[PDB]
Each structure stands twice: as C-alpha cells, then as structure tokens.
Design a protein around this ligand. Sequence first.
Ligand SMILES: NC(=O)c1ccc[n+]([C@@H]2O[C@H](COP(=O)([O-])OP(=O)(O)OC[C@H]3O[C@@H](n4cnc5c(N)ncnc54)[C@H](OP(=O)(O)O)[C@@H]3O)[C@@H](O)[C@H]2O)c1
Ligand SMILES: O=C(O)COc1cc(F)ccc1C(=S)NCc1ccc(Br)cc1F
Ligand SMILES: [Br-]
Length: 312
Amino acid sequence: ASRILLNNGAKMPILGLGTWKSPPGQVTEAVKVAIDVGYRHIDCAHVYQNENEVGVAIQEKLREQVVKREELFIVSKLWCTYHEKGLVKGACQKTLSDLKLDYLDLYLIHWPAGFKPGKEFFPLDESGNVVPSDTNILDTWAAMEELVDEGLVKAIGISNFNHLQVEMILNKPGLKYKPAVNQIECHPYLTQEKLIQYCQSKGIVVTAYSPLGSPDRPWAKPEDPSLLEDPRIKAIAAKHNKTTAQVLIRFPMQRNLVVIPKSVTPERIAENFKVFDFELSSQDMTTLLSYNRNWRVCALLSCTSHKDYPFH
Ligand SMILES: NC(=O)c1ccc[n+]([C@@H]2O[C@H](COP(=O)([O-])OP(=O)(O)OC[C@H]3O[C@@H](n4cnc5c(N)ncnc54)[C@H](OP(=O)(O)O)[C@@H]3O)[C@@H](O)[C@H]2O)c1
Ligand SMILES: O=C(O)COc1cc(F)ccc1C(=S)NCc1ccc(Br)cc1F
Ligand SMILES: [Br-]
C-alpha cells in the first residue's frame, strides 16, 4: 500500500525524496529522476535554500505531463524566523513561488522554536545563543490554520515536536485543524517508540527523517556510528537480497511511518524506491528496533536554551 490516509482525508505517499543538502546544481536532476522512476512525494524546506531548483524539476515534469499535480504530494516547512502572525503567509507564499505551485499538500512548522525575524536563519547574540521570538507554538498554529482556510495548503503539521508540544497543540483552545503529521528523526539508532506510539494513538502520521543516519550531515565526525555500515543491518539486507539502504527504508514503512531518504545520485534514487516488493519479518523488525542507542544526529547546541527546544 503506497499511500497512508491522513486525518485531513487526503492520501500521502509513504516514500518521498528528501532534499536537505542536495546541491542546487544537482537537485533539479535528482527530482526529475525521482519523478521518472516513481516518486510522488518531495520533502522540501525554505531553509534548505534549494526550493527554486526543486521547483524547476516539478514544473518541468508537470509541463511534460509525466505526472498530474493531483498525483504529487509536495511538503515544505515554515522556518523558525517566520513564526510571527504577520510573516507566516508570506513565508508560505515565497515557498509556493519558488516551488512553482499554487498549493502545498502539507506545510509543517519546521521546529517548535521561533527566532527573531530578519535575514539571518539563526540570529545569534554576541555569545552565540539563538535569539528567540516571543510567539508560542499555539499562535503559530493558528496562523497555519489560516493557510488551510485561504487555500494555500491542503494539510498542516509539525516537525521536531516532543510529546508535550504535540499535546499542547492537541489541547489548544479552539483548535480548528489537528496536525496531520509530525516529522521526526527516526532510524535504528533512534527508534522513537514512545513518541511514535503517542502520535499514532492521536491519529497523527509520523514521517521519519534521516532514515539512513544522515551520513552527509555537515557536523558528522569520522568515528560516529554508521547505519549503512553496520554489519548487523548488512546481514539482514543480505538475507533479503536487498541493500542496507533498502532495509533502512522498508523498516519505517512497516511501522506505518512515512519515510524520506535523500539522494542526489540517480542510481541510488532508483534503488531507494525498490522497496515495495519484499517484507521484513517481525523478528527482523524487533531486531532492528533493538539497535536503539538514543543517538540523535539532528540537534543544535546554539538552540538548546530556547524555551521551546524539543530535546531537553
Ligand atoms: N524536519 C527536519 O527537521 C528534518 C531534519 C533532517 C532531515 N529532514 C528531511 O529528511 C531528509 C532525509 O534526511 P537526511 O538528508 O538528513 O539524510 P538521509 O536520508 O538519512 O541520508 C542521506 C545520505 O545518504 C546517502 N544515500 C542515499 N541513498 C543511499 C544509498 N542507497 N546507499 C548509500 N548511501 C545513500 C546520500 O548520498 P547521496 O545524496 O550522495 O547519494 C546522503 O549522503 C532530508 O533531506 C530532509 O528532506 C528533515
Ligand atoms: O532542520 C533541518 O531540517 C535539518 O537541519 C538543518 C538544515 C538547514 F538547512 C540549516 C540548519 C539545520 C539545523 S542545524 N537543524 C537543527 C536544528 C534547527 C533548529 C532547532 Br530549534 C534545533 C535544531 F536542532
Ligand atoms: Br527548536
């Protein structure tokens, strides 16, 4: 089953293409190839600085009639410096303009924390701490709801929200639209059982980011754990005549998660999509879950004192 039903009534492809770190001179081809080989979901963000180039690909494939717009599921995210009532619509509109779209399928609050507006994505004080905004996650959520009512987005959701932050949203006085998705880091070294069960219990679909462990993250260190090189995961892959990446992508799929592996390599884009013709056993699944080490690749010291930093 290639799509999962969201609490807004729309269906979301369980496999998408990630675009963080995809170079602007490679991402247009990456997205073109992805659509040609079957991808229907692209995960984007304004902070990734490549939405224009992603958009060139989407638009060309729509113009070529490779795909219809209704068949695509395009996701983007509101950056931290736009949490303000008066900035949310324009931030969404910039993303739409760049992506060459008239609506998004899903728009996420990228991180729960708001930062001081301005040119800089991470405004810092003189001692290196991020400069917060005073706007909370409830007022930012109201601004997201307006986007649904204005036709700019079909669904809204959240990303990197912890259990208490999700609960805050769900308990919002006058809540109009529930979050459809919570997009969080998830892989065998950070299995997220507690947060996933909470979200799923509330009808919120979870998307797993960095499912391969983000080996290209800029802050990687040579001796960090490596999922793709873990011999235990290689052994499960060999047993199934699949690659390690294919196992790492199928794993979240069988947990009823959406998953968004990134690649700019055409052969790997195609490889990564060939995950609908095999099944991990229950024993395989439990074995992969057993590798949890609470190892989080996406975290940021400069933001750890923000009142809404999620990983405290
Ligand atoms: N919401 C958030 O805060 C948040 C945070 C992090 C990530 N995300 C989203 O999640 C996406 C995926 O996470 P990620 O980019 O951190 O990392 P990832 O998807 O876990 O790993 C990407 C890395 O794996 C490599 N790779 C891909 N397929 C491979 C294969 N078959 N064999 C070997 N290596 C392979 C890629 O290399 P090449 O590209 O060189 O092929 C790239 O270096 C992001 O791009 C972004 O869209 C969201
Ligand atoms: O964020 C992504 O999608 C992928 O990561 C990034 C992608 C970018 F284009 C720029 C920075 C990040 C960083 S550094 N993200 C971590 C991060 C940001 C904000 C807060 Br609150 C906490 C935190 F941990
Ligand atoms: Br945050």
